[PDB]
């Protein structure tokens, strides 16, 4: 038993809701919240900009130190950093950004990072400003992630569509 509430069950291990991941995070304090990161951990907009804003820019300060030490992530890769006031940990996962021309097949590799964590609150990778089809991101998620994933979908109209087209 865990503390997520109002999610619809899509599969044995994937759940979905219409929620603001920032607000869901501040209420659940999940062990892991997933950031929709880029390779530079520059959290300017989308989910990343919102999560970072909710941390009063502490996420960005920590991220800049990480990059200065380690260099950029790989597309499809991830790193674990602090969750600040939102979670114990933030898993920064880089899905491919279609608006940069990155290979959508890397989306499966991105979701594989979720399997290193028993339970996660996450957005749909490569959705939103990353330019991928969220219905596809959902199919890859379901077919790749084996751990328990609680997906927060900000847009109500999209949430209803994700639901009604799901197989």
Ligand X SMILES: O=C(O)C[C@@H](NC(=O)c1ncnc2[nH]ccc12)c1ccc(Br)cc1
By CB under 6 A, name the binding residues for ligand X.
20-22, 36, 46-47, 50, 95, 123-124, 126-130, 134, 152-155, 158
Of 30 and 46, nearer to ligand X (C-beta) is 46
Of 39 and 124, nearer to ligand X (C-beta) is 124
Of 20 and 64, nearer to ligand X (C-beta) is 20
Scan for tokens 């979720």, then name that residue: 114
Closest CB 24 distance from ligand X, rounded Å: 8
Of 43 and 89, nearer to ligand X (C-beta) is 43
Ramachandran bin of 76, using left for φ above 0, alpha for ψ from -120 to 50, beta for the remaining angles? left
Of 10 and 152, nearer to ligand X (C-beta) is 152
Closest CB 88 distance from ligand X, rounded Å: 19
* Planar angle of CA 23, 13, 161, nearest 5 degrees: 60
Closest CB 12 distance from ligand X, rounded Å: 22
Closest CB 38 distance from ligand X, rounded Å: 8
Residue nearest to ligand X (CB): 128
φ, ψ of residue 119 in degrees (nearest 5): -140, 135
Measured CA to CA, the distance from residue 86 to residue 51 in angstroms comes to: 8
Closest CB 119 distance from ligand X, rounded Å: 17
């Amino acid at each position: 038993v865990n503390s997520f509430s109002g999610y619809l069950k899509l599969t044995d291990n994937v759940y979905i809701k219409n929620a603001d991941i920032v607000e869901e995070a501040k209420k659940v304090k999940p062990t892991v919240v997933v950031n929709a990161a880029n390779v530079y951990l520059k959290h300017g907009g989308g989910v990343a900009g919102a999560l970072n804003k909710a941390t009063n820019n502490a996420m960005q300060v920590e991220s800049d130190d990480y990059i200065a030490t380690n260099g950029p992530l790989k597309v499809g890769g991830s790193c674990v950093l602090s969750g600040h006031n939102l979670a114990k940990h933030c898993l920064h996962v880089v899905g491919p950004n279609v608006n940069k021309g990155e290979d959508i097949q890397l989306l499966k590799s991105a979701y594989e990072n979720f399997n290193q964590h028993e339970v996660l609150l996450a957005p749909l990778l490569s959705a939103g400003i990353f330019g991928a089809d969220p219905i596809h991101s959902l199919r890859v998620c379901v077919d790749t992630v084996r751990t328990n994933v609680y997906l927060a979908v900000f847009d109500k109209n999209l949430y209803d569509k994700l639901v009604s087209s799901f197989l």
